[PDB]
């Protein structure tokens, strides 16, 4: 179980988002009717969104 923890730690400290462990969301204000836009991108879990 050694080369798993290592890979998981290498995964934690990373912007690739494999359970980044630095996952916090900040709410940016946007007036309507632009709400329909945004619209995440590459590695966004709809769950988190």
């Amino acid at each position: 179980p050694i080369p798993e923890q290592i890979k998981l730690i290498v995964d934690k400290w990373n912007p690739n988002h494999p359970n980044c462990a630095f996952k916090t969301y900040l709410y940016n204000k946007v007036d309507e009717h632009t709400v329909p836009l945004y619209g995440p991108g590459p590695n966004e879990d709809p769950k988190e969104w």
Binding site: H33, T34, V35, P36, L37, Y38, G39
Partner: protein, 116 residues
């Protein structure tokens, strides 16, 4: 969007911008390709800080039939943000740019889905 206004921030003092405005406008014309069908116009110049100046421009494009109109702001911004063009702009002292058009949600969604 039809008003075609792009705001540019320059890392230059206002007096320097105004003092060489002819040259600045022609350099922007060159960045656009320098053809006689495009004309850069200055809408306004405003000091923002000791060595920061905002210059608002638009570009008039002429058609083969002699008709003229402003380049849409989104279209002009899209050109200026292209990596090669942005670099040329930075060489003129531009450190930022903004369009006034408030994009629709669908436009924003498209930009996020295809950031390049």
């Amino acid at each position: 969007d039809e008003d075609g206004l792009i705001s540019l921030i320059f890392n230059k003092k206002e007096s320097d911008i105004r003092g060489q405005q002819q040259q600045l406008v022609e350099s922007l014309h060159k960045v656009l390709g320098g053809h006689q069908t495009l004309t850069v116009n200055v809408e306004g110049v405003k000091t923002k800080a000791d060595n920061q100046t905002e210059v608002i421009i638009y570009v008039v494009e002429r058609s083969p039939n002699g008709t003229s109109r402003r380049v849409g702001a989104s279209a002009l911004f899209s050109y200026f943000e292209q990596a090669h063009i942005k670099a040329n702009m930075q060489s003129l002292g531009v450190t930022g740019a903004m369009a006034q058009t408030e994009l629709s949600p669908v436009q924003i969604k498209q930009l996020i889905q295809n950031p390049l």
